[PDB]
Design a binder for this molecule. Structure first.
Ligand code: NAD
Ligand code: NAD
Lengths: 446, 446
């Protein structure tokens, strides 16, 4: 069966229909009308999985896919043209260009936290490059899994773009098929499993994993604006975002000031009780609810610390004077718990960060430009945003991807089209004349 | 032991010395003077492994590395600079750019057919990107392995750039270590193993594997020039070249003409008897001598066919009316055997190619531009060259890589630098002011 589904998609790609640029634009526009016409359903699905509301849904997920769709629908023609290359002395009379072409069948494996985004956005790039795409939605956010399984065949081509539903068993069986590229977003442990399956077929993979994205706060920094931005990004989806400020690094002198401004900003967004605000989200499930909660134990709780097991609620909690060897500083906190670790100097912040796996993101808050550049020039991470948070992943002109444990590969905008296609180097010398190649053929000069 | 060597490099890389662009250039120039001061020895080692003479050693191998070095040394500074990115409406005031940075320790595993180039060339891009490099020379070309293992320590940094000699057991053990990138040039089967090992540490890999590079000769084509060019690339290293025109596909009407024109050029390069020409290479070893030799059995030998077991010689043999199901058409011929397979049309030539694993190269010879374009546009291969052979692999401005079975990743010139480094996206808003982001923070509008 799963095999039959993969076959159906490959044979249809072999038909050559996706070779038409016109076709891709129509499909892309189908995807676009699918979203617009079903915003309500998508929002509702999102509400049932993570308790989002019409606004957080659109602005945090859906609105990003739509910007992607718009960029690529408009630029695709330019992206598809043969890219000319710089000629060398030897190639002055020859054509040297780069030809892009579909890879074939791409597997897009999504995640639960942003179930609509982490599945449809990569797909925009995959359809743009002329590939057939098989979506494997996360089963953890089951409501969106179903919606996508129903919506896709109502708008997309039913032979080229297919949705496979299922948990671990369905995926494992699916990873035995042969794809020309596997896009995966999830955990570092499972990322390994994915790559290992791909090795058996020599298939290339794009891996967006995660880690602990540090957030360095410099003394010379408007702490009011700084903390207003940091709080937004950190509690945005109940702390469940891949490029979220996992923990704060700062000098002990501003330790408490950070705390006050954070809780201030918390009040401005969610009022006195977060559990009252409709804009605050709920944790995905019980297992994660227990693990995030357990991370607050034997810790110095300065704010928050309360939770509601029934609604899978966990109050915007802040922790102070945290021990880097404690569990909140040993695992990626995929929740609303903000630890604050203290470092005596910038040198100290850098050594700290560099003593751990490379993160998907790195943030620096400072008024001193030199501090911003020294942080960047001396650390390594997928992407970076100085004096803000999350935002770098939202710019089409900035490719999104990790390094080391944060993963490999990138994918927003044109970088998506490139990744889901092959870039073939062609040197054309249709000039079968002017054979001044004499010097290359033997016999060798005596 | 191998563990300690890897430790030496990783710690050395942590010292941060490669960061200095000045250091890199000195290590790049050092490598350059190693080549320039030891040409005789390099050629010697090539002679003993593949029976190459100073002329074929330089122009086929050594001279390509020297061009790469010359390009990177001159363009490194510009390649290293942060790359500005196009701003969006929402980011007009901010800084958006891409910062390149070393990955760490890079393992380069080379192949025997071109033992100097296949190790030192990818290394050039690795050193340029500020990484520490560990060379794993092919043991099969034993002489180049001992040469390299002694020359490197004399010119390069003895902590940063280290050579590891060994066969299977040593490489196996060596593949358990953690590297930040693995460059590999070899067979498809071993490529699958290298990537499997890679999976364990989530390390990215550049794989240049092989396949059977087709060569379609069109009717409307100057058969003289064509065959002159094809004979040169095909027999260049006793046929032992990764991008060599593996077999010819043509209309029977010219089946015999090509044969005549090929053997004519053969006379022009190696005289009447190739076993007499000093410009003709010898098969690496006995094992390969036998496999290649056997591909001539049960075949219609239209030229050559003689061989000397003692000197591992195999004459420039041609074969006509070859059956696709015969062993010469089932495996990549890594020798001087050139089969001719007939097809009734261009559409047919295309279907033949697509019905097989993707090749590293695809060559087209014709005077009709439209046939060249229709060919490229309907097939897929790593690279392509129209009306010549091998040549695209020699243009630095042209990235070299495969697709599907021919491998993943590319590595010439600047593309080499990009590949051995991390391209980190940065969004700098040193502007902690003009905070008109109100519309993004909760509570959602009523
Ligand atoms: N889901 C995400 O976006 C995500 C991303 C990064 C880190 N994390 C964090 O990592 C931890 C565990 O998260 P989780 O998402 O693994 O929990 P989970 O168990 O709820 O989700 C597991 C996902 O992994 C898949 N999977 C499990 N075994 C597999 C296998 N053997 N082969 C292929 N796929 C397999 C499942 O089918 C499932 O969809 C938590 O701290 C979580 O916050 C989650
Ligand atoms: N060497 C090349 O550049 C090359 C490239 C493409 C295709 N080929 C072809 O493929 C066929 C076999 O070639 P070959 O070079 O494998 O012959 P070979 O046995 O002489 O070379 C084997 C190489 O593979 C390595 N290897 C073997 N087992 C390994 C393992 N288990 N883990 C890691 N590395 C391991 C060896 O250490 C060795 O360097 C021939 O037809 C040949 O022409 C060779």
């Amino acid at each position: 069966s799963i095999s039959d589904t993969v076959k159906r998609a490959r044979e249809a790609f072999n038909s050559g229909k996706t070779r038409s640029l016109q076709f891709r634009i129509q499909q892309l526009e189908a995807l676009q009308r699918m979203i617009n016409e079903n915003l309500k359903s998508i929002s509702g699905a999102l509400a049932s999985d993570l308790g989002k509301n019409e606004w957080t849904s659109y602005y945090e997920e859906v609105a990003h896919v739509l910007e992607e769709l718009d960029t690529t629908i408009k630029e695709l023609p330019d992206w598809a043209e043969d890219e000319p290359v710089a000629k060398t002395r030897q190639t002055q009379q020859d054509d040297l260009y780069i030809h892009s072409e579909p890879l074939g069948v791409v597997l897009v494996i999504g995640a639960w936290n942003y179930p609509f985004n982490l599945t449809i956005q990569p797909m925009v790039g995959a359809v743009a490059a002329g590939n057939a795409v098989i979506l494997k939605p996360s089963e953890v956010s089951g409501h969106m899994a179903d919606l996508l399984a129903t919506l896709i065949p109502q708008y997309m081509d039913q032979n080229l773009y297919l949705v496979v539903k299922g948990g671990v068993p369905e995926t494992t069986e699916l990873l035995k098929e042969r794809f020309d590229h596997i896009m995966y977003t999830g955990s570092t442990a499972v990322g390994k499993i994915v790559m290992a399956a791909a090795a058996k077929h020599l298939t290339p993979v794009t891996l967006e994993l995660g880690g602990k994205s540090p957030c360095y706060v410099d003394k010379d920094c408007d702490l009011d604006v700084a903390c207003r931005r940091i709080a937004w990004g950190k509690f945005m989806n109940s702390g469940q975002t891949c490029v979220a400020p996992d923990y704060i690094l700062c000098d002990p002198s501003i330790q408490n000031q950070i705390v006050e401004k954070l809780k201030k900003s918390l009040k401005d967004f969610y009022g006195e009780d977060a559990k009252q605000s409709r804009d605050y989200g709920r944790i995905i499930n019980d297992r994660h609810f227990q693990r995030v909660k357990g991370l607050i134990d034997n810790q110095k709780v300065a704010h928050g610390g309360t939770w509601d097991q029934s609604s899978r609620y966990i109050a915007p909690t802040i922790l102070v004077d945290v021990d880097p060897q404690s569990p909140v500083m040993q695992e990626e906190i995929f929740g609303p718990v903000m630890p604050i670790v203290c470092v005596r100097s910038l040198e100290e912040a850098i050594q700290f960060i560099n003593q751990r796996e490379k993160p998907l993101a790195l943030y620096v808050f400072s008024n001193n430009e030199k501090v911003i550049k020294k942080m960047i020039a001396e650390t390594s991470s997928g992407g970076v945003t100085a004096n803000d948070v999350i935002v770098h992943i939202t710019v089409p002109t900035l490719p999104f991807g990790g390094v080391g444990n944060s993963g490999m590969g990138a994918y927003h905008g044109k970088k998506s089209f490139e990744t889901f296609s092959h870039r073939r180097s062609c040197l054309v010398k249709s000039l079968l004349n002017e054979e001044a190649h004499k010097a290359r053929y033997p016999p060798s000069p005596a």
